[PDB]
Design a protein around this ligand. Structure first.
Ligand SMILES: *[C@@H]1O[C@H](CO)[C@@H](O)[C@H](O)[C@H]1NC(C)=O
Lengths: 213, 230, 229, 195, 215
C-alpha cells in the first residue's frame, strides 16, 4: 500500500476547481512533517509543484494552492486548464519508512465532448491460419475521454485467457485509441459459432461479433 | 544553472549488470543529498535509496536491499546506481533527484524532511530475454467500421517483432487519408505486435488497390502486403 | 568506539623540540562538545596534564609548562599536535592524548567531564645518545628433553637504545607461559631485555618456536628461531 | 496563543521503547523553555552546543523532540561520543549535536509490582547505528556461521529484549523518561521563536 | 595549585578483602573528583566520576565516597585482576591535577620458584661477549635472592636482574638474572651456577652447567 493515500483520479472541466487529497497518519504529518507536491507532466520528469505544504516555486501559477491540517493535506487547482492534465504526487517523511510518496492522482481536464468508441473486429486471416496461428484484432478509436474496458466473449461465454490490451493512446485529433488481441489456436477458432469483442466506455458498451464462416 | 543529467536508455537481458549515472552541475555536489526514485510500469513513485556525497553515507529502502548498490564519486560529481543481476521485473524508469538544505551541521540530519527540487530527466531501463526478430505481416481483410456512414477498415497485422520501432506506409506513401497505425502491444512472449488500418467507403472496395509497406530496420526486414476483399 | 593513537619520534636531544601528533579515527576531532588534551607520565611516577585544545583552535595550557608548550589542531587530517620547544630531562615520559566531553548546566554553566578516551601512549626519551638497534640471541632449551615435564626457552635482546622493544612468540599464537621481562639499563648506556616461555618438553620436536622482536627507532624487525641444540 | 506544543511530549501518558523512539517535529510557535530549565523535577538537564539560559532569546527554524524510556545508569549514554548498547544499537547523537537532553525518574508510572516488561531495547546488531538512525527490525541475529533462516535457536537470537522495571529496584535499574530536543537553524526564516 | 594527596602509597591485601584508598585535597573541589585505574603499560581507565558515580562497564565491587576535601575509593572484594595503580583527579579547576597514585598488590599463598639456566648462545660468543641467564618462574612473594657462583666462587657487580609485574590471574612473579662476562673471562672458568633462596624451597636450589653440554 502507501502510507500516504491519494485518490486514483480526479476530473474537472476547463475553468472549474478541484482538490486532490493526501491522507496520512501519526508517523507522517501527524508528527509535524510538512507535505510537498510534484507534478508529472506527460512525456516529462516529475517537477516540484508545492514545497512546505503551501509554497510555490517560481513558474508555478497561483491557481495551484496547498494546505495541511491534522493528518491530511490537500492540493487545490482553480481555473482548470488543459495543460494541468498530469499525474500529481504528494510526499512527506515517515518516522518508520523515511521519505514517502503518495500513490499519485491522474488529473483529467474534459475539454472535449464525450465520444463513443469506434470498434472494428478483424477475424484471423487465412495466411495466419495456414501457419497454425490465429489472432483476433479489436481496434478501438475516436473515443473521449481516454479510458475503455475490453471484454471478449466466446460464443456467449466469457474468455479468460489469451487477451492482450494496450493502454489508450492520444490520436492527432485529441481523441483516444486502443487495441485488443485475442490469440487462439485455429481449431478453437473453428469450433465456436461466434467470437465477440465488447468495449465499455463511460458505462456504455459497444459490441462487435465475427463468425468463422 | 542547477541540473542533473542521467545516462541514456538501456536495453539489457536478465542476469546482466547495469550501472547508470547522475551528474550534478551548478551546485556544490558534496553538500546536497541525492535520491534514486523509481517509476515502475503502472505504479507511482518510490524512493530506492539516498546518498550523501561528501561522506558516501548511503541508506537503502527494504524493497531494494541486496540487489542494488548506490555509489558516488566526488571528483567527477556523479552518483551511480548498479544492479548485480538484472531481473525483468526491474524494467522501468529511474529518476535521480536532489534534496537537502546544502548546509552543514545539524540541518544535514533532517534533510530527509525536505523536497526534491532538482530532478533528473530519467533513464529508461528495459530487461527482456528477446532478441532482434523481424515482423510477420498478415493482411487484415476489410471489415465493417460504421454501418451508418458505411465505412470499412482494411489493413495488415504486424506480428512478433523486436525491438521497437516499426514503420508502416500505404501504397508507398501516396495513401494518407484514413490511415491509422495503432501503437503496439507487448505480449507475454516479449515481442511487439501492432496493426495499421485504412478507413475507406465500403462501396469503394474493389476499385482501389491497397499495399502496406512494413519496414523494421533493426532486423533489416522489408515486407509488402496486398490487402484485398476476400 | 573512537580511537586515539599517538605518533612521534621516540628520541630527542636536550634543549630541542619534542613533537608528537595524535590521530583520531572512528570519530571527528571537529565535534562541538569535545575537548582534546595531552597528558604525560614520567617513568615510574605520576600523571601531569599539559594542555587542551578545541577544534576552533582555542587552547588552555598548564601554567608550569606554558613557556614551552604549543598545541595545534588540523581538522582536515583529524589530528592535534604537541610541541615542547626547549625540552629538558623532565621531558622523558610516556605521552598520552585524551578526549573529554562538556555540556552546559541548567544554570547555564559549563561542565566538563573527566577523560573518557585515551591513546595507547608513546614514550619519548630525552638524551644525547644515539639510536642503536638490538641484537637478538637464542636462549635455547636445555637437554632435559627426556623429561615428561616442562622446558623453558627464550630470546635475549641486547644492546639497544632507546626504548621500547616489543616481543612476540610464533606471531602471537603463543601467549601462555610468556614472560617478557622489563629492560635493564646496562653500564654501556644500552638496554637489554629477555623474553622467555615455558612449554611442554614433548613439544620440542613437534613445534617450532620463533620469537618476533621489534624495535621501531631502528626499524629492526627480527624473527629468531629458538632451536633445541 | 501559538504556544509550542511541548507538554504533549513531556507530559505524555505513554512513552516509547528506546529501540522505537518517537520523534515530533515542531514549528511555527513560541516556546517558553523556562518551564523546562526552571523545573527541579528533572534529574538530567544537559545541553550540548547551547546554554539553556539563552534559549528564550534565540530563534530556530525547526525543533525536533525525541523521547523514549531507558534505565538510570544508561542516561549517561544519551550524549555525543558515548558507547553502549543504547548509544550504539538504539539511539545515537551526532558529534556536531546542538540540543538538549532532559530526563526524569518515572518509577511511579513505568514500573509495576511483579515488574513491567512492556519496555524493550535492542541487544544485538550487525553494525552500530548512524546518528539519529532508527531500527525497528525484528530479524533474527546470526551470531554464528549457520544461517538462521528466520527462526530462533542456537546462535540465532531474537535481537530485542525487555527491561524489568520493579518498583523496589535500585535507582540505576529504575525507568527514566528521556526527551531530546534538537535545534536546526536554516537560512529560511526562524519560526520557533520563544520569548 | 590544588594538591591531591593519596593514602596509602602502597597497599597489599588478600583476595576478597575490602581495601580503601584516600584522596585529600588542599582546597574544596566539591564532588568534581574522578578515579582511574592504570594497569602497567596501559593507559589509565576511568572508574568513578562525580566521586560516587560509576562509569559503564566498571564492576560493582568498586565504590567511591566523599565531598569537599576528603574522598575514598573502596573495593569491596579485591580480585586478582585489580593489581593496578589507582589515581584520583580533580576536574573542578582549570589546572587539572592528579594524585600520586596508590599501588595495590595482591597477597596470596607462597609458591616456590621454578629455576632454569641458559648458557650463552654460540652467536653471542662469536660477538665477543657472554651473557649467562637464570630464570625464576611463577613465585610468591617477590622477595628472593640469586647468587652467581663461577668456579664455586661468589661473584658481585657483574650481574643484573629484572622482575615481572604481578600476574593478573595467578598473582605470582618471575625474575631473570643475567650475568655478563667477557668472551675471554668466560673461556677461563668451567662451571657456572646460580643458587636461589626463596620461602617455598626448604633448601636452596642450584642450577649449573659445564661449558660442554649435550647437543
Ligand atoms: C506538565 O504538567 C505540569 C502540571 O500540570 C506543568 O506544570 C508542566 O508545565 C507541564 N509540562 C510541560 C512541558 O508543559
Amino acid at each position: 500500500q502507501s502510507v500516504l493515500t491519494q485518490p486514483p483520479s480526479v476530473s474537472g472541466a476547463p475553468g472549474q476547481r478541484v482538490t486532490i487529497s493526501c491522507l496520512g497518519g501519526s508517523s507522517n504529518i501527524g508528527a509535524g512533517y510538512d507535505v510537498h507536491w510534484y507534478q508529472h507532466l506527460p512525456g516529462a520528469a516529475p517537477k516540484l509543484l508545492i514545497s512546505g505544504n503551501s509554497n510555490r516555486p517560481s513558474g508555478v501559477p497561483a491557481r495551484f494552492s496547498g494546505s495541511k491540517s491534522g493528518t491530511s493535506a490537500s492540493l487545490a487547482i482553480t481555473g482548470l486548464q488543459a495543460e494541468d492534465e498530469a499525474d500529481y504526487y504528494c510526499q512527506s517523511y515517515d518516522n518508520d519508512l523515511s521519505q514517502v510518496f503518495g500513490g499519485g492522482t491522474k488529473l483529467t481536464v474534459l475539454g472535449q465532448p464525450k465520444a463513443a468508441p469506434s470498434v472494428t473486429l478483424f477475424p484471423p486471416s487465412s495466411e495466419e491460419l495456414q501457419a497454425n496461428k490465429a489472432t483476433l484484432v479489436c481496434l478501438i478509436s475516436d473515443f473521449y475521454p481516454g479510458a475503455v474496458t475490453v471484454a471478449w466473449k466466446a460464443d456467449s461465454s466469457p474468455v479468460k485467457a489469451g487477451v492482450e490490451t494496450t493502454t489508450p493512446s492520444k490520436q492527432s485529433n485529441n481523441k483516444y485509441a486502443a487495441s485488443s488481441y485475442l490469440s487462439l489456436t485455429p481449431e478453437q477458432w473453428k469450433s465456436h459459432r461466434s467470437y465477440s469483442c465488447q468495449v465499455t466506455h463511460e458505462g456504455s458498451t459497444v459490441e462487435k461479433t465475427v463468425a468463422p464462416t | 544553472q542547477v541540473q542533473l543529467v542521467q545516462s541514456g536508455a538501456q536495453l539489457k537481458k536478465p542476469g546482466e549488470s547495469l550501472k547508470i549515472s547522475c551528474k550534478g552541475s551548478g551546485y556544490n555536489f558534496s553538500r546536497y543529498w541525492i535520491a534514486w526514485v523509481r517509476h515502475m510500469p503502472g505504479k507511482g513513485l518510490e524512493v530506492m535509496g539516498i546518498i550523501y556525497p561528501d561522506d558516501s553515507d548511503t541508506r537503502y529502502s527494504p524493497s531494494v536491499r541486496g540487489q542494488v548498490t548506490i555509489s558516488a564519486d566526488k571528483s567527477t560529481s556523479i552518483v551511480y546506481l548498479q544492479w548485480s543481476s538484472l531481473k525483468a521485473s526491474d524494467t522501468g524508469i529511474y529518476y535521480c533527484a536532489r534534496f537537502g538544505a546544502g548546509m552543514t551541521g545539524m540541518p544535514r540530519y533532517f534533510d530527509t524532511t525536505r523536497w526534491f527540487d532538482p530532478w533528473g530527466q530519467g533513464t529508461q531501463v528495459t530487461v527482456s530475454s528477446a532478441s532482434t526478430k523481424g515482423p510477420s505481416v498478415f493482411p487484415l481483410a476489410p471489415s465493417s467500421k460504421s454501418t451508418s456512414g458505411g465505412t470499412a477498415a482494411l489493413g495488415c497485422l504486424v506480428k512478433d517483432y523486436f525491438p521497437e520501432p516499426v514503420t508502416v506506409s500505404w501504397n508507398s506513401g501516396a495513401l494518407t487519408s484514413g490511415v491509422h497505425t495503432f501503437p503496439a502491444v507487448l505480449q507475454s512472449s516479449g515481442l511487439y505486435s501492432l496493426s495499421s488500418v485504412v478507413t475507406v467507403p465500403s462501396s469503394s472496395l474493389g476499385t482501389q488497390t491497397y499495399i502496406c509497406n512494413v519496414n523494421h530496420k533493426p532486423s533489416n526486414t522489408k515486407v509488402d502486403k496486398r490487402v484485398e476483399p476476400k | 568506539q573512537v580511537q586515539l593513537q599517538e605518533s612521534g619520534p621516540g628520541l630527542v636531544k636536550p634543549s630541542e623540540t619534542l613533537s608528537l601528533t595524535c590521530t583520531v579515527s572512528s570519530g571527528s576531532i571537529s565535534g562541538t562538545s569535545y575537548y582534546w588534551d595531552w597528558i604525560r607520565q614520567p617513568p615510574g611516577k605520576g600523571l601531569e596534564w599539559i594542555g587542551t585544545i578545541y577544534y576552533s583552535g582555542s587552547t588552555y595550557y598548564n601554567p608550569s609548562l606554558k613557556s614551552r608548550v604549543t598545541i595545534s589542531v588540523d581538522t582536515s587530517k583529524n589530528q592535534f599536535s604537541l610541541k615542547l620547544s626547549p625540552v629538558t630531562a623532565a621531558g622523558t615520559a610516556v605521552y598520552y592524548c585524551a578526549r573529554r566531553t562538556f555540556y552546559y548546566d541548567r544554570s547555564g554553566q559549563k561542565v566538563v567531564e573527566p577523560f573518557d578516551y585515551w591513546g595507547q601512549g608513546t614514550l619519548v626519551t630525552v638524551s644525547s645518545a644515539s639510536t642503536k638497534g638490538p641484537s637478538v640471541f637464542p636462549l635455547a632449551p636445555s637437554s632435559k628433553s627426556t623429561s615428561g615435564g616442562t622446558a623453558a626457552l627464550g630470546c635475549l635482546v641486547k644492546d639497544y637504545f632507546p626504548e621500547p622493544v616489543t616481543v612476540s612468540w610464533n606471531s602471537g599464537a603463543l601467549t601462555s607461559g610468556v614472560h617478557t621481562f622489563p629492560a635493564v639499563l646496562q653500564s654501556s648506556g644500552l638496554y637489554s631485555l629477555s623474553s622467555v616461555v615455558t612449554v611442554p618438553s614433548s613439544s620440542l620436536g613437534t613445534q617450532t618456536y620463533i620469537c618476533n622482536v621489534n624495535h621501531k627507532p631502528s626499524n629492526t624487525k627480527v624473527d629468531k628461531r629458538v632451536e633445541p641444540k | 496563543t501559538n504556544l509550542c506544543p511541548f507538554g504533549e511530549v513531556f507530559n505524555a501518558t505513554r512513552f516509547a521503547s528506546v529501540y522505537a523512539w518517537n520523534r515530533k517535529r515542531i514549528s511555527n510557535c513560541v516556546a517558553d523553555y523556562s518551564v523546562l530549565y526552571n523545573s527541579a523535577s528533572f534529574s538530567t538537564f544537559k545541553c550540548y552546543g547551547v546554554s539553556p539560559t539563552k534559549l528564550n532569546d534565540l530563534c530556530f527554524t525547526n525543533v525536533y523532540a525525541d523521547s523514549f524510556v531507558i534505565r538510570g545508569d544508561e542516561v549517561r549514554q544519551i550524549a555525543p561520543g558515548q558507547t553502549g548498547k543504547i548509544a550504539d544499537y538504539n539511539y545515537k547523537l551526532p558529534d556536531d549535536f546542538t540540543g538538549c537532553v532532559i530526563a526524569w525518574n518515572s518509577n511511579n508510572l513505568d514500573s509495576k509490582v511483579g515488574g513491567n516488561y512492556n519496555y524493550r531495547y535492542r541487544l544485538f546488531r550487525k553494525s552500530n547505528l548512524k546518528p539519529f538512525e532508527r531500527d525497528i527490525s525484528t530479524e533474527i541475529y546470526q551470531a554464528g556461521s549457520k544461517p538462521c533462516n528466520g527462526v530462533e535457536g542456537f546462535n540465532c537470537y531474537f535481537p530485542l529484549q525487555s527491561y524489568g522495571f520493579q518498583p523496589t529496584n535500585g535507582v540505576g535499574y529504575q525507568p527514566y523518561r528521556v526527551v531530546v530536543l534538537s535545534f536546526e537553524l536554516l537560512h529560511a526564516p526562524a519560526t520557533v521563536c520563544g520569548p | 595549585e590544588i594538591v591531591l594527596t593519596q593514602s596509602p602509597s602502597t597497599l597489599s591485601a588478600s583476595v576478597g578483602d575490602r581495601v580503601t584508598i584516600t584522596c585529600r585535597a588542599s582546597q574544596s573541589i566539591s564532588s568534581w573528583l574522578a578515579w582511574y585505574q592504570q594497569k602497567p603499560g596501559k593507559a589509565p581507565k576511568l572508574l568513578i566520576y562525580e566521586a560516587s558515580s560509576l562509569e559503564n562497564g566498571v564492576p560493582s565491587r568498586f565504590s567511591g565516597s566523599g565531598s569537599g576535601t576528603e574522598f575514598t575509593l573502596t573495593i569491596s572484594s579485591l580480585q586478582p585482576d585489580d593489581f593496578a595503580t589507582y589515581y584520583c583527579q580533580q576536574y573542578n579547576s582549570y589546572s587539572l591535577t592528579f594524585g600520586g597514585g596508590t599501588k595495590v598488590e595482591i597477597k596470596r599463598t607462597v609458591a616456590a620458584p621454578s629455576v632454569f639456566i641458559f648458557p650463552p648462545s654460540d652467536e653471542q660468543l662469536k660477538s665477543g661477549t657472554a651473557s649467562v641467564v637464570c630464570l625464576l618462574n611463577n613465585f610468591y612473594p617477590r622477595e628472593a635472592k640469586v647468587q652467581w657462583k663461577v668456579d664455586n666462587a661468589l661473584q658481585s657487580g657483574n650481574s643484573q636482574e629484572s622482575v615481572t609485574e604481578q600476574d593478573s590471574k595467578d598473582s605470582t612473579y618471575s625474575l631473570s638474572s643475567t650475568l655478563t662476562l667477557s668472551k675471554a673471562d668466560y673461556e677461563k672458568h668451567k662451571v657456572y651456577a646460580c643458587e636461589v633462596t626463596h620461602q617455598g624451597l626448604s633448601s636452596p636450589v642450584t642450577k649449573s652447567f659445564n661449558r660442554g653440554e649435550c647437543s
